[PDB]
Amino acid sequence: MFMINILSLIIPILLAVAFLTLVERKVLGYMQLRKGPNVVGPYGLLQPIADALKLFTKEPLRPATSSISMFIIAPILALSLALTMWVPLPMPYPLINMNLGVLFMLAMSSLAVYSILWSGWASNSKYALIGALRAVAQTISYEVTLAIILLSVLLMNGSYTLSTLITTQEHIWMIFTSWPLAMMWFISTLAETNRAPFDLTEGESELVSGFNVEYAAGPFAMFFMAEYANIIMMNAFTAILFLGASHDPHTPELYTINFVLKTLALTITFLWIRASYPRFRYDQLMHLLWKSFLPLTLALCMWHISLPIMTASIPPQS
Amino acid sequence: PPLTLEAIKDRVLYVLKLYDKIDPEKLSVNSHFMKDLGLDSLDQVEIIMAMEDEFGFEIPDIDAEKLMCPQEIVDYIADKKDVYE
Amino acid sequence: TMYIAFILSTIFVIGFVGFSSKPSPIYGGLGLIVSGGVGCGIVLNFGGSFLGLMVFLIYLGGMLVVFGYTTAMATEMYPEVWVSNKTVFGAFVSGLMMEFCMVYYALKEEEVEIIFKFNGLGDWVIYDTGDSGFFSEEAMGIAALYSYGTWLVIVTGWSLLIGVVVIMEITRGN
Amino acid sequence: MPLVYMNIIMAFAIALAGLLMYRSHLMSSLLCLEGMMLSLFIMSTLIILNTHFTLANMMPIILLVFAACEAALGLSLLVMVSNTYGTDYVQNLNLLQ
Amino acid sequence: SDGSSRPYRCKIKAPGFAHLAGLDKMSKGHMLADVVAIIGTQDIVFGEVDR
Amino acid sequence: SRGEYVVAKLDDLVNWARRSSLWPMTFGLACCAVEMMHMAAPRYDMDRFGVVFRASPRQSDVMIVAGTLTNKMAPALRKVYDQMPEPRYVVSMGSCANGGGYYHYSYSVVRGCDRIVPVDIYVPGCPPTAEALLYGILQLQRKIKREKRLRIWYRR
Amino acid sequence: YPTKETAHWKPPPWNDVDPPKDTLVSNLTLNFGPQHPAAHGVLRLVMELSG
Amino acid sequence: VKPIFSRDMNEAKRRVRELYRAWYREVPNTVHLFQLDISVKQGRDKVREMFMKNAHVTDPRVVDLLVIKGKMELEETINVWKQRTHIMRFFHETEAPRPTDFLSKFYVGHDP
Amino acid sequence: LIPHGKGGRSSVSGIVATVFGATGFLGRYVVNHLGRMGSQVIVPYRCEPYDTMHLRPMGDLGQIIFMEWNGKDKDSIRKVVEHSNVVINLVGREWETKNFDFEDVFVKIPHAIAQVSKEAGVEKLIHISHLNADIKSPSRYLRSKAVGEKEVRAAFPEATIIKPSDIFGREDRFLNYFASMRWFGGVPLISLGKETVKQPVYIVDVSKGIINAIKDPDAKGKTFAFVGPNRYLLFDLVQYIFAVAYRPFLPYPLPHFAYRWVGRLFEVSPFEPWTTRDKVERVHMSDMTLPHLPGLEDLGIQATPLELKAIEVLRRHRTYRWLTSEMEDVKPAKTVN
Amino acid sequence: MNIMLTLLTNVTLASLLVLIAFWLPQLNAYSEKTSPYECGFDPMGSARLPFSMKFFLVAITFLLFDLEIALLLPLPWASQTNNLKTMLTMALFLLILLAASLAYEWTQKGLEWA
Ligand SMILES: NC(=O)C1=CN([C@@H]2O[C@H](COP(=O)(O)OP(=O)(O)OC[C@H]3O[C@@H](n4cnc5c(N)ncnc54)[C@H](OP(=O)(O)O)[C@@H]3O)[C@@H](O)[C@H]2O)C=CC1
Ligand code: SF4
Structure with a gap:
């Protein structure tokens, strides 16, 4: 019955990308004062x-x-x-x-x-x-x-x-330990997913819907859909990886009830980014990375290589 | 090959035989290309541009002002090829 | 059994049949994608998972992309599909018949006469007990690279560095 | 030797014959070479997984590195040849084979 | 005015016209996005240009 | 459970579907571009009706033709109209391109927008108030809702 | 000991073999609007962009 | 009195011949690139005809002015300015036939 | 009305042509040549407004007038004739719909059209039937159309009757069809070569011919028939089809019964089948070569050769590799006649 | 097995969406409708050579960093080795060279990106 488990993983998520679209127009709407979709719902739903x-x-x-x-x-x-x-x-x-x-x-x-x-x-x-x-x-x-x-x-x-990444967050959360890397992870998820300030693949006004143009009906729906798959997914990923939570094995469901919050709390933020910043242009988009993010990623990297030895705090897993 | 003058003449009249305004009966080497042939003046330009399309080099149009006889143009082709034999 | 690792080897080989035939680099890039995923799968079957995911990451997630750049610099109008020429398609068929002869030799179950003997039968047979404590052989096996094998780290560091220098000293010349 | 190894080796032989049949623009050759590289990699790793000859678990990745490294170099030369022509192998300046 | 009630000629200066003329000098060698922004700093309106 | 009953149901489903979220692309050629934007302005918000301006015809269907058309421009218009997916529509707008309107008599105008594309609804104005436009498109939905290819296809 | 078929070939250049350089002619040319959102519905800024 | 270009006729006629060379040679490229399905000959003939249209102009400056207005068109087709519509425009192909015979015209309409 | 002004988009003409079933390939072109005249038309739709929509530009404000109708109700056809000066029948169908049984389409409808054409005092009536409509055991369309042909002739005898010799155009259901036979793989020939032969007429020519036929006082009860200037062999013809479509060409020889097994297999689809046994009989029967009947040239129009015009018709089938090419490269096909 | 099963169900799912995407609308494709988009006016020519040194000049550097991170990956496991002082230098070492490589590019003006 593993198959029905898989099906149980795939249907709900597609439903989630659909309603993600709707939420996108909603919130992104209310940032604009204007109400989002509404008339067909009753609540747009x-x-x-x-x-x-x-x-x-x-x-x-x-x-x-x-x-x-x-x-x-x-x-x-x-x-x-x-x-x-x-x-x-x-x-x-x-x-x-x-x-x-x-x-x-x-x-x-x-x-x-x-x-x-x-x-x-x-x-x-x-x-x-x-x-x-x-x-x-x-x-x-x-x-x-x-x-x-x-x-x-x-x-x-x-x-x-x-x-194990749950187990290692049974208290403080990773984020307090290494938030600056969390920033860079966040933005890298903000660009790898091709989103708001890092907007170029769609191009939009810059390149009239970019690569995606010539695709018409269904395939367009596929790229659109898959794009939102990646957005919610990197969001969930960041959530588990930088934000731990209490976990009683006897009641796993409790944990999930918490988890979807902590991840949804991220996804909304992308939308609330989208309503806020003009896109970078292809020069600066790569400028800030190669010139500015990266060297910090390295210095932070040696630093994090070096803490476990100086602190004598080497993590358990073999 | 050495490119004999006969190749040049054969090709000139070949291109002029392929062309339409010049009926095979109208053809005559020494005869002045306009003074005898009834073809329109644009035809000079069309066939010359075709023949030079074969020999490959652009004809400056002062040489379009040559003409006189097709054979003199053949002589010019010898002048460019510098074979003259 | 399933012979699944072996049939993966077969799809691998035809991945090189369509790849080694030379029909515009882009489709060949597809050829290395297919052969790539098949590759990581095959090495995954022995459980050296970290490596299969290196190639599935470092290679295919790196290379064939940069080739997806070279074609932007090369292309030429009307790139050829595999079907677009008699020598290319002829070549692809030329690979298929050979590899199929190998599979027929697998049906023969006799040791291969080509080049040198192939012992035959299923892949599983060579396996031995994988018994170990809470660590895979691979894990500490590659972890050894730093502590226990500093020399290679030195020459690789030096090599890649001066390779960057070489890229400079080629492109800057123009 | 188990048939699978024979199959990978043959994939090498094709990954070479493809390099040498060698035709038109050469970018195909850098592909075929990288395919060759990959076959050697896999054929190595299966072995190091076989005998639990653990130290050599380090080699395949290191192999990969330099091999990928040279290929990384190779494109650059192609650029230059692409720079003056729009690439094709069919055009070579040098004389005497 | 010709003196009649129908004006004889009424050439209309369009400030945008000069700007857009100056654009290509102003925009050589710039990145393609930047030419898009720079069209906008010209704040031009084509209805005025084409008169 | 008559087949016609089910056909009535599917008719309702797809025509309601297409009418419920059409996606205009816009030639805001002239000065009726701005009124189009006030439809999308918060105070009227076209989006709540589900309609959303998305560029590139291949991802869009209904087409607004705001503002005056001109001669050089026309062929591009026909191009764009041809590259739209079925079931494409268009919407002439203003006195603009209903028939030249103000500029009815000049060498460069192409009278109506009608003379290059098969228009659906007209929305007279100069500029039409954005709200009169809104009544326009709602009227367009009340025309899609009367579409019924399925009922007819079964009938034939 | 040249063959005549080889004799037709020219002697090698005393340095750079510069002539082939004349051959590169790469270019691209492309148009914005009218549709293009940045083209304000009525601009046809054709341009011979590089890379 | 300031001449535009060439002084006296003939000096200008060579210009126009040059122009014919340019147009003629360019035409097959026009049919190719534009995907025009006109018979490849027909464009050439039509070119020759358009060249016959002013084949009686005799003023000094007016003819060179004519090759000025003649440059711009090949200038446009070479730059892919104009289009299939715009270049197919010359053939008047959609027009209803209009015989110049007096009686023929006479039956049809009030005429001039 | 007396015609006024230069013929043109604004021009009036007396014609208040009524065209039935114009939604198809013919007569979208026929309406257009009416429209360049500026002549009024009353094309009436059976189907849906949407497909008809592109008909709209063709007119000039008040010209084109869609009207709802049915071929089955008598008065429904009384509607669109009701002020028509002339009424024209272009209705035809290859695959027999259920509710419209294959016979009535070629019988009843032309009948009611003919007698109502009588009662309304319609100035002219005109009707179409395939040249092979002359009765033959294969195919029920030639025969049913022969029946409505003879019927309208029996009912509106002074009507001229179209007998077109296969029209080829971009919107064709024929040339595109054999172009699309590639999709299955080969091209089913019953026995290749001279098993059957066909001649074609440009669609444009047929349209110009029809309206010219209204332009001809002489075109009264005469049964006009249209044939293109050239003569071709079906095998060499399809050879020219894939010679212009550049697709690989595989002749596919076939015992005659099996092809009909195929047609029976493909009539099954609820929608609009690619093939049908009726079409199967449209395949292998050659056109008759009779010229003595009044026809296209008698109108004074000369046919446009297919040889220069197939290219535009089939370029959409071309693969991108070959999508741009001069037609002349393909080589003019040899003419059997 | 497990993973191959989910791969198959995913790919078959997607392919199913494709087939219901094409064989469904059931309407009329035709030429010029199928012509490539070019913001209205027809293309001046099929896509050719958007050449740039500024592509590879950095993209190659990508490739040679990605090879490096490939060596960085063993680190978490290597951290638990019995003798870190033998390791630690190297753990730093490569990163220095990584940085060093970048640094060399940083200022030979080889990093003009764009
Ligand atoms: N090459 C050719 O095609 C030739 C054709 N002909 C004849 O000339 C005629 C014109 O051909 P063509 O226009 O291509 O054929 P089409 O199918 O394109 O035209 C027929 C049109 O009439 C409509 N129609 C007819 N009767 C009915 C009905 N009872 N109910 C609903 N709709 C109806 C059809 O469906 P709707 O309008 O409902 O969509 C269609 O639009 C045909 O009848 C044909 O037999 C003769 C020689 C050659
Ligand atoms: S409607 Fe008013 S605004 Fe829009 S174009 Fe016609 S006149 Fe100018």
């Missing part, structure tokens, strides 16, 4: 399914110039990995007890953007190619610092296994 139906019902043309195979395979990979990254996530009990699933989170995250590269390559359009390319730039440029700071915050939990 029925909207996202009407939305998705509007999409899938609508004709999804196969472009004349595009090669078709890449053009179809890319969205598939997008939702694929967007969902697959969810499996080893301790809530509290992981669906899979990977010995080193964090590293796996990095693996999925790193194959993610490759789909963007195909998405813009097979699309054949000028905007497609240029936007896709700059997209891959910002992405990788952030995955390096990404993985380093994640390393440095992992020296002290003990090991790459995720469940």
Whole structure:
């Protein structure tokens, strides 16, 4: 019956990305004073399914110039990995007890953007190619610092296994120990997921919906959907990794009741970022990283390498 | 190859035989290209640009002001090829 | 049994059949993606999980992306699909028949006569007891790299560094 | 030797023959070379996993490094050759094979 | 005025027109996003330019 | 459980679907661009009706044609109209492009917007008040709701 | 001992073999609007952008 | 009196011939790049015809002025300025036929 | 009304043409050539407004007038004829819908159209039927259309009757079809070569011909038939199809019964089947070459050769590798006749 | 097994969404509608060569850092080795070179990114 467990992991999350869309227009609406979607609800609630139906019902043309195979395979990979990254996530009990699933989170995250590269390559359009390319730039440029700071915050939990990361937070929370790395992790999740100030992949006014343009109905729904999969997912990831909680094994549910709060509390923040800052432009986007984030990530890294020895505080896990 | 003058002449008249305004009966080497042939003045430009499209070099249009006879243009082709034999 | 590791080896090899044939670098990049995931899976089956995830991360999550940059610099109009030429497609078929002959040799169950003998049968047979305390052999096995093997760390550090220098001294020249 | 190893070795042989059949723009060759690299990697790691010859667990990753490293270099040269032409192997200045 | 009740010619200076003329001098070599921002600092309105 | 009953249900479902969250793209060519924006201004908020301006026709359907059209411009307009997914619509707006309007008699205008694309609803104004526009699009929904390809397809 | 087929080939340059440099002609050219949101609905800023 | 370009006729005629060379050679590229499905010949012929349209102009400056107005068009088609519509425009293909015969016109409409 | 002014988009003309079922390939073009004249039209929809919508630009403000109707109710057809000076029948269907049984479509409707054309005192009536409508055992369309042909002829005898010799255009259900036969794999030939032969007419030519036929006083009861200038062989024809579509070409020889097994297999789909046994009989039967009947050239229009015009028609089928190419490269196909 | 099962269900799920995405709207594709988007006016040419040294000049540096972090990964486990003084220098050492490499790029003006 493991299969029904998996299905039980995949349906609720898709429902969550739909209602995530709706919340996005809501909050992001009230920042603007204007109310968000409302009339169709009554509280808007029925909207996202009407939305998705509007999409899938609508004709999804196969472009004349595009090669078709890449053009179809890319969205598939997008939702694929967007969902697959969810499996080893301790809530509290992981669906899979990977010995080193964090590293796996990095693996999925790193194959993610490759789909963007195909998405813009097979699309054949000028905007497609240029936007896709700059997209891959910002992405990788952030995955390096990404993985380093994640390393440095992992020296002290003990090991790459995720469940232990609960155990190592049975009191103080990791964040008080190494918040600056939490900042850089936050922003790196704010760019790797391609979000608000780090907005370039969509391009928007800069490049009229970026790479995603030539995709029409359903595949567009897939990239859109998968994008929100990554946003909520890196949010949850940050939540478990920098914000611990009380956990009685006899009542696991209690913990989850807490956890969705602590993660939702993050996701909303991205939206409340979106309502706040103009995008960086491709120079500065990479400037602040290579010039400014990174060296601190290193100095902090040696520092965190060095605390366990000076403090004689080396974490247990073999 | 050495490019004999005969290759040049053969090619000139070849391109001029491929062309439409010049009927095969209208063809005549020594005969002045306009004074005898009834073809429109633009045709000079069209066939010359085609022939030079074969020999490959641009004809400056002072040489379009040459003409006189197609053979004199062939002589100019010899002048550029510098084979003259 | 499942022979799952072995059939993974087969998909691996055809991954190199479509890859070693040379039909625009981008599709070959796909070839190394497929062969890449198949690779990490295969090495995962012996449980050297950390390594399989190195290649699934460091290689495919690194390389083939930068190749997804070279093609932006190379491309040329009308890149060829595998089907787009008689020598390319001919080559792909040329790989398929050979590897299929190998699988037929696996059906023969006889030791392979090619090059040198392949002992045959299932993969599992070579396994031995993996008994250990609360640590995988791999974990401390690679952890040894720092404390117990400083020399390699020195030469790798030096090498990569001066490799960056070389990249400088090539690109700056223009 | 178990058949799987034979299969990977053969993947090497193809990863070489592909490098040497060698055609058109050379970027394909840097690919084929990297594929070759990957086959050697996997063939090594399966062995170090086999005999529990633990120290050598360090090698494959180190192997990988330099190998990837040279390939990382290789693109740069291609750039330069791409810089003057828009790459193709078909164009070589040097004389006498 | 021709003296009639219909004005004879009514050329309309459009301040935006000069600006947009000056743009390409102002924007050489700048990054493509920056030319987008710089169009905006010109605060131009094309209805006025095309008159 | 008549088949026609189920067809009435699916008819209601897809037509209600498309009418419930259409996604305009906008040629705010002339000066009726700004009134379009006041529809999206908080005080009227087009978004609460679900409609949301998203650029790039391939991700959009209904098209607003605010503001005066001109000759050089027209071919681009036809291009954009052609590149939209079915079921595409458009909306002429203002006295602008209903038929040249104020500029009905000049060499560069192309009279109506009608003469290059098959318009749906008209929203007369100069500029139309954004609210009159709002009544416009709601009227557009009350026209989609009468669409019924499914009922007809079964009938044929 | 050249072959005539080889004899047709020119002697090597005494330095840089500069002539081939004339060959590079890479360029790109591309257009904004009218649709483009930054193009204010009515601009066609065609431009010969580099990378 | 200031001349625009060439002094006297013929000096200007060479200009126009140059222009014909440019147009003629460019035309197949026009049909290719624009995906025009006009017969590749037809554009050429039509070019020749347009060149016949003013084949009686005789003023000094007016002809060079004519090649000024002639440059800009190839200038546009080479820059991909104008479009399929704009360049297909010359062939008047949608027009209803209008015979110049007196009686033919006579039956049809009130005419001039 | 007496026509006024230069023919043009604003121009009046007496024609108050009524076109039935114009939603299809013909006569969207026919309405357009009416529209360049500025002549009024009353195209009436059976289907849905939406598909009809692109018909709208073709007119000039008050010109085009959609009207709701049904072919089955008598008075429903009395509606759209009610002020029409001329009424034109372009209705046809390849695959027999259920509710419209295959016979009435070619019988009843033209019938009510003919007799109502009588009662309303309609100035002209006109109707279409395939050249092979002459009765033949294969295919019920040739025969049913022969029945309505003979019927309207029996009811509105002075009506001229179209007999088009296969029109080819961008919106065609024919050329695109054999172009799309690639999708299955090969191209099902019953026995290749001269097993059947066809000649084609440009769609544009047929349209211009129809309106010219209203422009012709002489085109009264005469049964007009349209044939293109060239003659082709179905095998070499399809050869030219994939010669312009650049797709791989696989002739697919086939015993005759199995193809009909295929048609029976594909009639199953509830929607609109790609193929049908009726279409299967549309396949293998060659057009007759009779020219003596009044026809296209008799109108004074000369046919536009297919050879220069297939390219635009099929470029959408082209793979990106070949999507831009001159038609002349393909080589003009040899003419059998 | 476990993981392969979830991979299969995910990919089959997505592929299912694709198939219900295409074989459903059931309407009319046609030319020019299918022509590539180019903000209205037709493209001046199919995508070619957006060449830049400023791509690889940094992207290669990405690749050579990613190889480095690949060596950083063993660290958490190496931390528990019996003899840290033998280790610790190296733990710092590579990072210095990482930084050093960057530093060398930092100021040879090789890091112009963009
Ligand atoms: N090459 C060719 O196609 C040739 C065609 N012809 C004949 O000329 C005619 C024109 O061909 P073409 O226009 O391509 O065929 P189409 O199918 O394109 O045109 C027929 C139109 O009439 C409508 N229609 C007809 N009867 C009914 C009905 N009872 N209920 C609802 N709708 C109806 C159809 O459906 P709706 O309007 O409802 O969508 C369709 O729109 C055809 O009848 C054909 O037999 C002759 C020679 C060659
Ligand atoms: S409507 Fe008023 S504002 Fe909009 S264009 Fe016509 S006139 Fe200018």
